[PDB]
Amino acid sequence: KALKVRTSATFRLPKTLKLARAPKYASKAVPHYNRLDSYKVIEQPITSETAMKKVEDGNILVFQVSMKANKYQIKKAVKELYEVDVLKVNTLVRPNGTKKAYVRLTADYDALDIANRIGYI
Amino acid sequence: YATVSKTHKTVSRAYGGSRCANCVKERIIRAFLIEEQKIVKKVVKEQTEAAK
Amino acid sequence: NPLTHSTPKNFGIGQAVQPKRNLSRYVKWPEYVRVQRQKKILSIRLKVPPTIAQFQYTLDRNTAAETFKLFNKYRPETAAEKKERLTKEAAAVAEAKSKQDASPKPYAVKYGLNHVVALIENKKAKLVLIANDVDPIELVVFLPALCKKMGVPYAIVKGKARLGTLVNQKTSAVAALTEVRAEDEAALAKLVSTIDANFADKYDEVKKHWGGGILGNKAQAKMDKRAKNSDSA
Amino acid sequence: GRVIRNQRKGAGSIFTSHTRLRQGAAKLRTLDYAERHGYIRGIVKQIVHDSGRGAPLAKVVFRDPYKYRLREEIFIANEGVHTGQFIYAGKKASLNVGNVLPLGSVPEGTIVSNVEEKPGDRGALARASGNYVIIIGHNPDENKTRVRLPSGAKKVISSDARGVIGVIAGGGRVDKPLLKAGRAFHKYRLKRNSWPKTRGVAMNPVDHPHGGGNHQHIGKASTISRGAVSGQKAGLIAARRTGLLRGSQKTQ
RNA sequence: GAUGGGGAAGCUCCGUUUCAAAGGCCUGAUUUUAUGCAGGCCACCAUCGAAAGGGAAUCCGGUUAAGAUUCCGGAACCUGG
RNA sequence: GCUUGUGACGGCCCGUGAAAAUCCACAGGAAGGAAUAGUUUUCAUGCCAGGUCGUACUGAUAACCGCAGCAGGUCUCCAAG
RNA sequence: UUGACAUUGUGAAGAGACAUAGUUUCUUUACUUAUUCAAUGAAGCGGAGCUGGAAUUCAUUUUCCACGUUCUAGCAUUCAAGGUCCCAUUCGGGGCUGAUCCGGGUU
Ligand SMILES: [Mg+2]
Ligand SMILES: [Mg+2]
Ligand SMILES: [Mg+2]
Ligand SMILES: [Mg+2]
Ligand SMILES: [Mg+2]
Ligand SMILES: [Mg+2]
Ligand SMILES: [Mg+2]
Ligand SMILES: [Mg+2]
Ligand SMILES: [Mg+2]
Ligand SMILES: [Mg+2]
Ligand SMILES: [Mg+2]
Ligand SMILES: [Mg+2]
Ligand SMILES: [Mg+2]
Ligand SMILES: [Mg+2]
Ligand SMILES: [Mg+2]
Ligand SMILES: [Mg+2]
Ligand SMILES: [Mg+2]
Ligand SMILES: [Mg+2]
Ligand SMILES: [Mg+2]
Ligand SMILES: [Mg+2]
Ligand SMILES: [Mg+2]
Ligand SMILES: [Mg+2]
Ligand SMILES: [Mg+2]
Ligand SMILES: [Mg+2]
Ligand SMILES: [Mg+2]
Ligand SMILES: [Mg+2]
Ligand SMILES: [Mg+2]
Ligand SMILES: [Mg+2]
Ligand SMILES: [Mg+2]
Ligand SMILES: [Mg+2]
Ligand SMILES: [Mg+2]
Ligand SMILES: [Mg+2]
Ligand SMILES: [Mg+2]
Ligand SMILES: [Mg+2]
């Protein structure tokens, strides 16, 4: 017999087999626990006077919230730590490097009632 | 243009939204006439090969 | 025929895209290939001194075949064979009262370069096979000259790998016989005869002949057709 | 003293060429199978101004012998070529303004442009507005061909070396006075930063061999040796004569 | 401005597609089964660089001590699924 | 009328006045697809979702640079009788 | 910049000495693989052959060229239609030819 028969003049790097890692030992002995559970996410309530008003008038719960956390993580954690339904979650960074969440509950819930059953007023 | 029905992006002749009708008139004519004269060249130069 | 049509394409400058063809003559090989090829070329464009080039003259496939046939009946122990032998003398001998001599005199091919060399110097080898590969050629270049002087019959043979097979290594550089079972003493003299005829007998004259010089074939034809017409009107 | 202007140009800092707007490099077709055995047709699809060039480019597109697609070359338009014109490139092409042929394939007195110095270098001789070369003879055995470039220099090249029939377009561009500083200003604005020019004789010595003195004056011969050194070569380098050229020039 | 490279005693300098074996998509193949191979293409060769260049889509009324084309009301629209 | 927008034109040039992401179209016809029922989401309506950082105010005869609440300097839009 | 030495090899003619055998040295002019420069998504190189045909045969071919594209601002892609052979005839699909042979020196 005789030779190959390449129709292209470019020689490309042969497509060779890539084994997946099967370690003889482990990364770190023990997985890190959840770095951002709901208790780390929603830090404490914000109870400024002008914040309080949003709660009476807007069905909104103002919280200081972990800087590391996004609107998804704020939303769910309010939902879970408080048994409530959230419409949408607006956020902003305070000028002292903390995050404020304007959490609006759905109309089924009554933020006022809900705020003095977390305990503040 | 991706929020608009395909009718907004054509007319209904060959090469709709692409070239402009008069231009397609030219394209057809010349295509025909040239494919025709191909047949002419073939049979003329064919006869060359039979009396030369 | 039916509603089927013959359309033939015209592939002739100015029309129809060229078709797919075999361009293997034109592929842009990996630099490493390019090198190992041009190294072979450069090796033969030059005039090569007589003491190399005496290689290249390899043993022929027939004679060789008959030599690998004989040399095979003389392989060295396998690891099992040895494990098995030992326990047949470890167990025996020491208790049966031998002299590590419930073992028979072994007859195997001698190998390893530094080994074989002393054998030749000691006139103990009776048939030596030199490879034709051996990339630092120097490991081996002095072997024909040696064997010649020690009056030892040798042959340059294709296959450092092939030598390797008959001795259980990947490669083996040289293989030699010094020993032989009388059932074989015979057709060894036969082998030493053709072999001595193709090499040792020729050596003194092979030594006078350079190598290489060879043109590539674009240049070869250039002057098979130049030196054709110029003389021949 | 300080490094003088003409040595500073070489580091190309503010001296690299202004290039943002240019069309692309002007070039013949690659010298492929088609062009060296037969010929291949293209169409000029546009002839167009190129920033800071004096002569218009012609965009000419061709079919691709080896793939279904178009390939567009950028040519320098020879005078008289036009949109829609067909362009033939190849050994077996015919002698018309616009086509590209190997100087071996064309009779003496042929007038061509953008000619290669070595076959395939995709064109190097006579590209500027108005210029051309003339074939002034061939020599078949060892196939060389001999031309006269625009400079007056006669030179020989491979007969395989290609060129394009006719002259380069835009001629006469230099018979019209620049008239004011502003038109040279815009002229160089699209080339490189070489305008305006301070006379070294108006500089101080730190700046230039010519600089300084209590009247402006070159102070020593302004004909500098070939073997002079950087910072020395300003003025008339290697000048073999000097003074107003009385009498007809024209290479003998 | 990284990278195969080439300089440099070296800190580093040159090159940016350059003398490099430079890479990923569409689905077919699976009905051990989850993604190995069976076609073909594509050879485009990093990346950073514009809060005045290019660029998917929101508006009016109301509201605060201090925010608003961002909140409230109402009414839209874009992108992905 | 004034400002701004936009059009169809005209003058000028040895000046002829960016790029890329991105979107659409056409040529092509691999393929797939109905009558006992198929093909169709570039037509309408319907469902879910849209993270991260900036967002206050000054912008100057006092929030900027000139040792300063300095007659200096520091890019721009709106513009009534 | 200029010379020498090293990188540095291969033929041929010509001069140079043991003093008109060839080891050696220079001068010319050849070679190509060192080195050097250009090109391209290393595509059609070199050598033969087919057919043509100018050519005139001094036995019969001794040769030399050509060996798919030029009124037109169309169209040219799915390993190619055709022909032919297989699979076991399903729909799919494969080989060969279409596109001659040889050498793997990308030019
Ligand atoms: Mg309420
Ligand atoms: Mg925000
Ligand atoms: Mg329409
Ligand atoms: Mg044995
Ligand atoms: Mg530049
Ligand atoms: Mg200037
Ligand atoms: Mg001046
Ligand atoms: Mg001057
Ligand atoms: Mg002065
Ligand atoms: Mg001076
Ligand atoms: Mg001086
Ligand atoms: Mg002076
Ligand atoms: Mg003066
Ligand atoms: Mg760098
Ligand atoms: Mg960027
Ligand atoms: Mg921007
Ligand atoms: Mg912008
Ligand atoms: Mg408002
Ligand atoms: Mg408020
Ligand atoms: Mg405000
Ligand atoms: Mg709203
Ligand atoms: Mg609504
Ligand atoms: Mg949608
Ligand atoms: Mg204005
Ligand atoms: Mg214009
Ligand atoms: Mg469109
Ligand atoms: Mg098919
Ligand atoms: Mg829709
Ligand atoms: Mg994402
Ligand atoms: Mg504001
Ligand atoms: Mg103020
Ligand atoms: Mg200070
Ligand atoms: Mg001030
Ligand atoms: Mg090539």
Cα A92 to ligand 2 centre (Å): 5
* CA-only gyration radius of chain C, Å: 27
Q: What does each C-alpha distance from C196 to C7, C63, C193, D178 come to in angstroms?
A: 68, 12, 5, 94
Residue C230 DSSP one-character state: T
Question: How far is Cα of residue D138 from the mean position of the Cα atoms in its chain?
Answer: 24
Residue in D81, D78, D64 with CA at minimum distance from that of residue D115: D78
Six token digits for residue C10: 């015209």
Q: How far is A14 from chain C (nearest CA, A)?
A: 11
Interface check A4 vs C, CB under 8 A: yes
Taking CB atoms and an 8 Å cut-off, how many pairs form between chains A and C? 24
CA of D250 to the centre of ligand 8 (A): 26
The answer to whether the CB of C150 falls within 8 A of the CB of C176 is no
Distance of CA C132 to CAs C54, C56, C75, C144, C191, Å? 10, 7, 21, 12, 19
Taking a C-beta distance cutoff of 8 angstroms, is the pair C106, C73 a contact? no
**What percent of the residues of chain C are helix, what percent strand, and what percent coil, each to the nearest 5?**
40, 5, 50
Torsion sign, CA atoms B22, B23, B28, B30:
positive
Maximum Cα–Cα distance for chain B, whole Å? 67
Cβ contact A65:A42 at 8 Å:
yes
Q: Are A99 and A67 in contact (CB under 8 A)?
A: yes
Spatial CB neighbours of A19, under 8 Å, sequence gap ≥ 6? none
Nearest residue, CB atoms, C13 vs list D34, D67, D68: D34
Contact D243, D230 (CB under 8 A): no
Which residues lie closer than 8 Å to C210 by C-beta, 6 or more apart?
C47, C48, C49, C50, C53
DSSP state of C77: P
Residues facing residue A100 across a β-bridge? A64, A92
* DSSP H stretches of helix in chain A: 38-41, 49-57, 71-82, 111-115
Tell whether omega for the bond before D209 is within 30 degrees of 0, i.e. cis.
no
Q: Which of A4, A5, A9 lies at the smallest CB-CB distance from C26?
A: A9
C-chain residue closest to D65, CA distance:
C17
Q: Looking at residue C213, what DSSP letter applies?
A: -
Question: What is the 3-class SS of C40-76, one letter each residue?
Answer: HHHHHHCCCCCCCCCCCCCCCHHHHHHHHHHHHCCCC
Terminal C-alpha separation, chain B: 63
At residue D70, φ and ψ (nearest 5 deg) are -95, 155
**Quick one: DSSP state of residue D78?**
B
- The integer distance in angstroms from the CA atom of C4 to the C1' atom of E39 is 27
Q: What's the sign of the alpha-carbon dihedral D141, D142, D145, D149?
A: negative
The pair of three-digit structure tokens given for residue C154, joined into one six-digit string: 């040798």
Residue D245's alpha-carbon distances to A57, C13, D226, in angstroms, are: 99, 54, 22
Experimental method: X-ray
CA distance C149 to B2: 91
User: Amino acid identity of C136?
Assistant: P
Cβ contacts of C61 within 8 Å, gap of 6 or more: none
Is A8's Cβ below 8 Å from some Cβ in C? yes
How many other CB atoms are found less than 10 A from the CB of residue C94?
Answer: 11
Question: Which ranges of chain D does DSSP label H, i.e. alpha helix?
Answer: 5-8, 33-37, 181-189
One-letter amino acid for residue C52 of the chain: I
Alpha-carbon span A96 to A82, nearest angstrom:
27
| Cα–ligand 2 centroid distance for A90 (angstroms) | 7
DSSP assignment of D117-157 equals SSTTS---BS-STT--EEEEEEETTTTEEEEE-TTS-EEEE
CB-count burial class (<10 Å; 0-12, 13-18, 19+) for A45: middle
| Residue with the two structure tokens 């690299």 | D16
Cα(A75)–Cα(A87) distance, rounded to whole angstroms? Answer: 9
Give Cα C2 to chain centroid, integer Å. 62
**C184: its two tokens:** 């074989």
Breaks in chain B after (C-N > 2.5 angstroms): none
DSSP H/E element including D59:
strand D57-64
Q: Does C25 touch chain A (CB under 8 A)?
A: no
Instruction: Report CB contact under 8 Å: C14, D37.
Output: no
